[PDB]
Design an enzyme around this catalytic site. Structure first.
Site, mmCIF file in Angstrom:
data_model
loop_
_atom_site.group_PDB
_atom_site.id
_atom_site.type_symbol
_atom_site.label_atom_id
_atom_site.label_comp_id
_atom_site.label_asym_id
_atom_site.label_seq_id
_atom_site.Cartn_x
_atom_site.Cartn_y
_atom_site.Cartn_z
ATOM 1 N N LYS E 167 0.854 -1.190 0.000
ATOM 2 C CA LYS E 167 0.000 0.000 0.000
ATOM 3 C C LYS E 167 0.893 1.245 0.000
ATOM 4 C CE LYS E 167 -3.637 -2.619 0.510
ATOM 5 N NZ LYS E 167 -4.674 -2.777 -0.550
ATOM 6 N N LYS E 193 2.344 -8.852 -2.092
ATOM 7 C CA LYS E 193 1.712 -8.920 -3.411
ATOM 8 C C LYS E 193 1.353 -7.579 -4.005
ATOM 9 C CE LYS E 193 -2.752 -9.963 -3.627
ATOM 10 N NZ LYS E 193 -3.259 -8.626 -3.966
ATOM 11 N N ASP E 195 -1.167 -5.013 -5.571
ATOM 12 C CA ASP E 195 -2.586 -4.864 -5.300
ATOM 13 C C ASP E 195 -3.247 -5.358 -6.586
ATOM 14 O OD1 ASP E 195 -4.901 -4.019 -3.841
ATOM 15 O OD2 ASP E 195 -3.718 -2.354 -3.033
ATOM 16 N N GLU E 196 -4.502 -5.789 -6.512
ATOM 17 C CA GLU E 196 -5.171 -6.297 -7.707
ATOM 18 C C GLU E 196 -5.150 -5.325 -8.884
ATOM 19 O OE1 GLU E 196 -7.134 -5.627 -4.778
ATOM 20 O OE2 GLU E 196 -7.350 -3.645 -5.708
ATOM 21 N N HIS E 286 -6.828 -13.511 -7.670
ATOM 22 C CA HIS E 286 -7.562 -12.463 -6.971
ATOM 23 C C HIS E 286 -8.960 -12.445 -7.581
ATOM 24 C CE1 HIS E 286 -8.920 -8.517 -5.665
ATOM 25 N NE2 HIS E 286 -7.933 -8.518 -4.788
ATOM 26 N N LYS E 326 -13.082 -6.279 6.782
ATOM 27 C CA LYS E 326 -13.834 -5.168 6.205
ATOM 28 C C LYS E 326 -14.809 -5.565 5.098
ATOM 29 C CE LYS E 326 -10.213 -3.973 2.834
ATOM 30 N NZ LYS E 326 -9.048 -3.087 2.517
HETATM 31 MG MG LIG Z 1 -6.049 -5.470 -3.075
#
Ligand SMILES: [Mg+2]
Ligand SMILES: O=C(O)[C@@](O)(COP(=O)(O)O)[C@H](O)[C@H](O)COP(=O)(O)O
Ligand SMILES: O=C(O)[C@@](O)(COP(=O)(O)O)[C@H](O)[C@H](O)COP(=O)(O)O
Ligand SMILES: O=C(O)[C@@](O)(COP(=O)(O)O)[C@H](O)[C@H](O)COP(=O)(O)O
Ligand SMILES: [Mg+2]
Ligand SMILES: [Mg+2]
Ligand SMILES: [Mg+2]
Lengths: 140, 468, 465, 140, 349, 237, 119
Positions: E167, E193, E195-196, E286, E326
């Site tokens: 992030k 990883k 992020d998608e 994902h 979340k």
């Molecule tokens: Mg993600």
């Protein structure tokens, strides 16, 4: 059950499945052209070049996709840019058919905004043609 | 006026294909057929039929024969010798001109010689005992990727038989457990380990996963022992594309050897693989899976010696030869016979060993015989005496069945082999002093002692089916 | 519970008479002949063991996996009627043991080493139950009977073929000459003899080109689609593929392959190529009799036929029953059904040991060939029906007037028998009359009938149920 | 020894090597269709579309294998699904040939289980055609 | 005579509602939570779903006679009422195995959920589950490796694996990405990883990222003595771009890559899964976009079906939700599809 | 439209290559079930080899049916235009599948036009400038027949492809007659519009007039005269 | 020869007027694909200059309108027509569409006039 005949039943795209257009119906289509401000134009071709064919593909590699000969016909004079008089269009049909009495002749109209032909239909077929059927003989 | 013309109709095959006075040419491919004609069918006719329908003729006269020269291409039954003490059996010899065969194609050779004749109604049984492959035809084959001498030179191993071992259970082990077993086996003294013949690629273990773990196992064992190690990674597959993908992976991993089931995979695929191995420096172990379906019975089929010659031509660095004393059949004389046919450059005719024709290999590489199947430490003396140093002796259950595990099991076999090899070199008679050699080694080898105790009572002795 | 080194009877692990077979299991029926002193149960267990997960002595590694899950199982043994030391041992193999789409792997396990065991004197694999879940892992035949007929535009009668002769020795142009004359007379196909690949007297590419001219000349002349199975069988896969590619580039309809002498690995690759390129694939079973002739040992042809259907083939020789090569009627009718149908029920009277569900895999066109002639037509049509190809090699090139007349004679005999059948006539009874009537207006057929009228092939059958 | 003529000896698949089928033999074939519960259907085509040709291949790369023009003919009405009366079929043959007297017409039958044409033969050949030979003139 | 062709419209139920049909073990089965429009009988609505997802259309076609509808037609063989709903039903449909292309999830979805969800005759439709028979399962290559093999390659056993998404999602440079990755991995995480949505963008081009991530992976592994990995995203606009990225990962010798199977697509995903199998790369999947389809109870496709589909198309990892995080994920439902994606045999529950 | 939709990109391409080698004009692809990554690759191949690409929106309703959750079709249509497609199903409005008129006219403009201004009455939340990207041909298909022709022409105009599957193979005289009936209906309506007639009010009379000289159309009109699809709309603005 | 020298502060202007290319260097080049003689021999045109024509407007025409203009130009007596220098591949006309329509035009004009045509 009526059977749609596969023999000598050649068509000519738009309006060829309707009864032959009367001069009145043809004039109406012309008014449609002018009312929409489209560009009228006549095209013609001798019988041997009236329908699509694959002759040139003999010179090709594997690239014949959507290539056909005889789609392009011959332009009668020039597109009638600025034409707002249907009588004008009808007079050129008479002149073209008179000059080439044994040729196939079609009336088309162009739209310069989308830049594409927006209408068209046959207005003359040689009297010698024997590859088509009258409305009442398309099915037997 | 009118010479020999076309006459429609059927006539005896012997009128064209039985030529008892024919003098075989040195380029002719010769075949020895053990044939059993149907009652009322003369051996001359049955023999002529075999030669005809495996070369140029059919059941009725065809006019097209006149366009070519039948004398030049026809196969010929040139001799028929009765088989003593048997039920209407004869050895029919047939000569085939070299022109009838596609160069370098074992597939084509078999297609003509054993293509349709075995099914003729006119005969009750037929068995191809031997084939004389002339030097002129031998030279059309690439042959084995490397051969015995080159193999030893690449592995840097000399002075003793090589040691192998099939991982077990046959199927059901995961890729990592396969690698685990391999490492433990190799580190104990075995030169090789191998995928079972039926281990290709399955749900319980996909091939590429196995290849990677086995590679780690191979390199770990080699670094630990200081001796070159290998594991026959199976390239046998459903298609040639899959077969080649597996060979390419072995090449990319730098591993020394792969294997192929030449009969279940096929000659066409095997020849392609052999050529790839030659061009890429990979040793090729050949498993004869399915051979017994063809070579077990005396009256019908193809004797293994022919299947062995075929493999040598198609290409293979190793080829299972049987053990004689193990769980699978293999008569001593017959075995010693085709072992020579697999390894040597020139083998004289010797019927006492099933060798019907003198065979000249014209320098084609020799194939390493592999003795495998139900053998253990007590069999070592016999194995060394039978095969000598140029062979690979494999112990699958004989290693993974050791009470102390794979490494000790491997050590026990390695110790037994070296002790027998030393004894022979010193002039001792292994056939007579075998047990004493093994027992003596047990005194300083706890590993061997354990193996000897477990299998001391195990032997395989049954009536032999494939007798000369 | 623990590992115990040493040898123990196979039956303790591999003889499970109370096992309920699973619908995904591959089943095998073995005609087993034990050595004296070896209990049938131990012999059957040995077969199951050494063709699945076990070896001669106990291995500790079994403990890392689940033998119950992977082991082959001899679940039933029945004595063979009339045999003192012969039994049918049934073995079940979990689907997990096989590589998807690989006939080579299936054969490697089931018939890999068990046939050479000292403990048994003879063994023969009679049948295999190929479960739908395994059938579905195979591409199967390039096209199949229905698609083949649709591509050739041929319906309502058996197809007619013909092997060019002499087997070997003809030049490429003479081959094409013979082919043209054969095809123009009424035959749908002609073919390279199984051993005709590429040789000094005739290289393959030369043959492919001349045959192409012949096919097209015959097709244009007759107005019927023509073909000639060009042989792609070769010493290597690279050569096999070069030949298939040439056939593709010439636009011809069909090639052939000797699946057994070439091998399943090569065959499967070729079948896939044919599927992806639109080539019909004729399969010749050269060498099969080496394996399937004897009743006591080997592999019955029905298994070799199932294997080919899986590996892939549009055509497969099925025998003629009445020709020069052996083929008992009942077992032939049995495997012909196994070759063509989608579902074949168990029927021991025809050697069908297990009910076989092909789960829509295309059917293979049976090919009756070998020592047959015009007088055999009634029987052939009666035995095979329309879905088959009847080939007359000597029966065409052996006609006194040449290939064209010979071809017309066979085509006439076929259509006359087909017409008669459709009319409800009993070919088995009126066969002779049908042929004789046709002779009245067909001089070509009359000539053929006179030449082979007394020729028949009747011998004691070796491959009996 | 008689020579099979290569000139004007065109065939038409199943039964074309037998003497022309009499109306009684045709009726027999029709009963065969009905007795087996197959679906009768008629197809026709003008002379120029009767035999296989290779015209379209001019547009192809190397994929002409088992491709031919003219295998497909024109369907007469629809397959006679359900038809269990041979007289119905025989009458349609008349209706079809009446509609197209100068075309090739063939009677076929479909099996919906194997989903393939199960039988078929030519029922009409244009009378003006001279590209075929009668049984007595096939060899000289 | 017998059954003939009769032009015109007739109820779907007359051909597609077969309440006595006995499902075959090779049939693909579907469970649809169906909400019919008022005036439309449940059996007719269920029949329409079965028909338009298999062999039929809105009016009678003569071509049915050329083949066998009994053999190919989809069948609504059961209609179950939904407790607490008087206009919602579970309609069960059986599809013969012949209707599907082997190894193609794309084809399976095209039939079962292709057009029926838009029919005017129904107000809502949701595919709850699919019974994939062994005979069809066997036509798929499946996941590149699977749980056991993955653990064996990573040499990790006895505990759950630990991952981490870098992030901020977007905005980081290639080097800073590798910087954050090294620091994450060296502290104890097994994986990190992309992020998608991190593919290749102006602020960070993919090849730059792959290279710096490789340095970070190898530095962290050497420092900790534990095998490390970072899911490098192969998700791209075209298959050519997707493969180029997979190839780069192969060339760098890294252990794992990832793919967004729903936004990239099943066709692309299956190709990538096959590549990973033949090249030894672990494939993390994902599920981006899944909630657009599986969130609502009345319409769409439940995640369990999307999970079965992925297992078939191929994937070594697949996000399963957290239950407590979340994003939504009911406990019982989650436990259910976790078994469906991990186990060999899962009993109806 | 020969379908190139497949389980893997390799199979998809083998199919597109075969179409190219046969010289045929058009192939199709199910962009949502096949996927955007595969679709973009296919569209690029079609651009480079001259193949027309028809796009089928299979599965779209799984995502765009409900008003409260999902993605409206207009967004799925913009996405396809970007990914690549010469044709894209747009719904029929009057057919068997749902498609509210105003919403439909809205995304049809978003599919074909170069510039579409914001218009909430048609679900167009933002002015969209396509900056000369080619327009996509909308395809009206699903449960439509000859009587729907007037409405279809009035709704879509000339730039659209109207598809009649059951509406053709369901004709009592077969496919050819069924095809002729639809072609006649289309040309009759087109001619009427060009002559200034109001298809929204005179449609029925145009069709009935054509029936007098077209037995093919008359037979079609008889079979489907009472067939209509009118249900409560789920996807409301 | 012209890499950096034109920017030297020491000079105010520089222009390369000519270069003497020696045969020894000339021979190291493949050179023109065909040349005047070969071109005339492939086109079968001799005895007069060749006639060409750039299609207009420069940009803005569609692929089919391009082919339409080309056919009409070629059929009237011109040996060649041509894409304007800036006509490559653009939104209003992608190159492959143009190549296909122009090919139809070239072949139609050639068949009509009996003279080899090109664009
Ligand atoms: Mg993600
Ligand atoms: O499958 C087996 O049985 C083996 O792995 C041996 O296992 P063990 O070492 O545990 O006995 C071998 O393949 C056989 O030796 C093959 O027979 P042959 O050598 O006769 O071809
Ligand atoms: O070589 C031959 O003998 C044949 O060409 C037949 O020749 P004829 O037509 O002249 O007899 C065939 O290959 C056999 O039919 C094969 O046997 P099967 O069909 O049993 O496999
Ligand atoms: O499967 C079908 O139903 C169709 O072939 C139409 O059949 P009919 O012509 O027989 O109705 C079309 O795919 C739908 O139009 C798709 O829906 P949409 O256009 O809404 O995406
Ligand atoms: Mg083994
Ligand atoms: Mg033969
Ligand atoms: Mg310019």
């Amino acid at each position: 059950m009526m059977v749609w005949t596969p023999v000598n039943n050649k068509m000519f795209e738009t309006f060829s499945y309707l009864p032959p257009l009367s001069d009145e119906q043809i004039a109406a289509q012309v008014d449609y052209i002018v009312a929409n401000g489209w560009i009228p134009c006549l095209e013609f071709a001798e019988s041997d070049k009236a329908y699509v064919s694959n002759e040139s593909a003999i010179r090709f590699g594997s690239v014949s996709c959507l290539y056909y000969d005889n789609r392009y016909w011959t332009m009668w004079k020039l597109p009638m840019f600025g034409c707002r008089d249907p009588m004008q269009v009808l007079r050129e049909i008479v002149a073209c058919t008179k000059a080439f009495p044994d040729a196939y002749v079609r009336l088309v109209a162009f739209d310069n905004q989308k830049q594409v032909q927006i209408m068209g239909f046959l207005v003359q077929r040689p009297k010698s043609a024997r590859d088509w059927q009258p409305a009442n003989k398309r099915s037997v | 006026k009118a010479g020999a013309g076309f006459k429609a109709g059927v006539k005896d095959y012997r009128l064209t294909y039985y030529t008892p006075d024919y003098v075989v040419r040195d380029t002719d491919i010769l075949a020895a057929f053990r044939m059993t004609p149907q009652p009322g069918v003369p051996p001359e006719e049955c023999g002529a039929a075999v030669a005809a329908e495996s070369s140029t003729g059919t059941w009725t006269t065809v006019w097209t024969d006149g366009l070519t020269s039948l004398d030049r291409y026809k196969g010929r039954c040139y001799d028929i010798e009765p088989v003593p003490g048997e039920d209407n059996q004869y050895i029919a010899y047939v000569a085939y001109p070299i022109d009838l065969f596609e160069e370098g194609s074992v597939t084509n050779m078999f297609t003509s010689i054993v293509g349709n004749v075995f099914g003729f109604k006119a005969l009750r049984a037929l068995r191809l005992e031997d084939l004389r492959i002339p030097p002129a035809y031998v030279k059309t084959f690439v042959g084995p990727p490397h051969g015995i001498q080159v193999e030893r030179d690449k592995l840097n191993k000399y002075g003793r038989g090589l040691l192998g071992c099939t991982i077990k259970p046959k199927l059901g082990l995961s890729a990592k457990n396969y690698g685990r077993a391999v490492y433990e086996c190799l580190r104990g003294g075995l030169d090789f380990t191998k995928d079972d013949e039926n281990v290709n690629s399955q749900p319980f273990m996909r091939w590429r996963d196995r290849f990677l773990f086995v590679a780690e196992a191979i390199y770990k064992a080699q670094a630990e022992t200081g001796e070159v190690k290998g594991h026959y990674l199976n390239a046998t597959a459903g298609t040639c594309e899959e077969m080649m993908k597996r060979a390419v992976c072995a090449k990319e991993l730098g591993v020394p050897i792969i294997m192929h089931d030449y009969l279940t995979g096929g000659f066409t695929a095997n020849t392609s693989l052999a050529i790839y191995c030659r061009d890429n420096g990979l040793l090729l172990h050949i498993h004869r899976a399915m051979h017994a379906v063809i070579d077990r019975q005396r009256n019908h089929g193809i004797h293994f010696r022919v299947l062995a010659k075929a493999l040598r031509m198609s290409g293979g660095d190793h080829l299972h030869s049987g053990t004689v004393v193990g769980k699978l059949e293999g008569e001593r004389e017959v075995t010693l016979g085709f072992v020579d046919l697999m390894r040597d450059d020139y083998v004289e005719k010797d019927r006492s060993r099933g060798i019907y024709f003198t065979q000249d290999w014209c320098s084609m590489p020799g194939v390493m015989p592999v003795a495998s199947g139900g053998i253990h430490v007590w069999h070592m003396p016999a194995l060394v005496e039978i095969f000598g140093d140029d062979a690979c002796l494999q112990f699958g259950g004989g290693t993974l069945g050791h009470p102390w595990g794979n490494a000790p099991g491997a050590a026990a076999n390695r110790v037994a082999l070296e002790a027998c090899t030393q004894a022979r070199n010193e002039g001792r008679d292994l056939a007579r002093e075998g047990g004493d050699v093994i027992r003596s080694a047990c005194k300083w080898s706890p590993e061997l002692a354990a193996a000897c105790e477990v299998w001391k009572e195990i032997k395989f002795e049954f009536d032999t089916i494939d007798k000369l």
